[PDB]
Amino acid sequence: YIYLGGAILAEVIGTTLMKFSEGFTRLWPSVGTIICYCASFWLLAQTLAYIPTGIAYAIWVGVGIVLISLLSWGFFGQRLDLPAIIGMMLICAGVLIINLLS
Amino acid sequence: YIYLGGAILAEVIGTTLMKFSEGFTRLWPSVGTIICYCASFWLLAQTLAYIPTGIAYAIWVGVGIVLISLLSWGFFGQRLDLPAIIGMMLICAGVLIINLLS
Numbered sequence: 332y333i334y335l336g337g338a339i340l341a342e343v344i345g346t347t348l349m350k351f352s353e354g355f356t357r358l359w360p361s362v363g364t365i366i367c368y369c370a371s372f373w374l375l376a377q378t379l380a381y382i383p384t385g386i387a388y389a390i391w392v393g394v395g396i397v398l399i400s401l402l403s404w405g406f407f408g409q410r411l412d413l414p415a416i417i418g419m420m421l422i423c424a425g426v427l428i429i430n431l432l433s
Numbered sequence: 434y435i436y437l438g439g440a441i442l443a444e445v446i447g448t449t450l451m452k453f454s455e456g457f458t459r460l461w462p463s464v465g466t467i468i469c470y471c472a473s474f475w476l477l478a479q480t481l482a483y484i485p486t487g488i489a490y491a492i493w494v495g496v497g498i499v500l501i502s503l504l505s506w507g508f509f510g511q512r513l514d515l516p517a518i519i520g521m522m523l524i525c526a527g528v529l530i531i532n533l534l535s
């Protein structure tokens with residue numbers, strides 16, 4: 332499967348893997364995050380080799396923000412109106428404006 | 434704290450070490466650059482002791498669009514246009530809100 336899509340997934344899944352309980356979690360290796368970083372950085376290296384570097388990083392932030400925010404709101408029941416999220420919206424709107432001119 | 438700035442900075446320092454260290458007669462070993470990358474992930478783990486994952490990500494993304502812009506531009510060009518100034522200012526405003534959280 333495609334390197335860039337794998338790289339986008341690697342962070343979204345990786346952070347979701349880090350967000351596990353202090354209790355017991357099924358199927359979680361304690362070396363898992365360290366493996367996920369090694370996998371993520373290998374995928375990134377392939378991604379930057381074979382796609383234009385500015386394009387790849389602009390797409391990676393762009394998809395990743397929408398995907399984590401939709402996943403977190405939709406299936407983990409999280410709030411979009413909390414103080415930090417309100418500041419984050421301005422960053423994400425500003426990021427879109429620069430990306431439209433790129 | 435200085436952990437979040439340090440974690441972002443370690444990725445930039447490691448990138449700078451990687452870009453500088455072309456050739457193989459050079460004194461510096463690739464492992465030293467790997468230690469700078471290992472440090473960034475460890476500094477992120479220190480960051481996530483008292484900071485939520487999304488809040489840390491939003492600040493990293495706010496700097497990240499500037500990192501994309503420097504990568505896209507290389508050398509600096511002429512002064513920014515009105516929508517670009519607004520988009521950059523919205524990123525500035527979001528960081529100002531996030532850093533004024535108690």
Ligand SMILES: Fc1ccc([P+](c2ccc(F)cc2)(c2ccc(F)cc2)c2ccc(F)cc2)cc1
Pocket residue numbers: 338339341342371372374375388443444470471473474490493494497
């Ligand atoms: F050109 C680039 C583009 C992206 C990165 P990235 C990244 C890429 C792919 C992935 F699957 C997970 C993380 C990163 C951050 C600290 C490091 F030590 C190594 C990589 C990263 C993480 C969070 C963020 F908000 C922005 C970038 C580095 C250089």
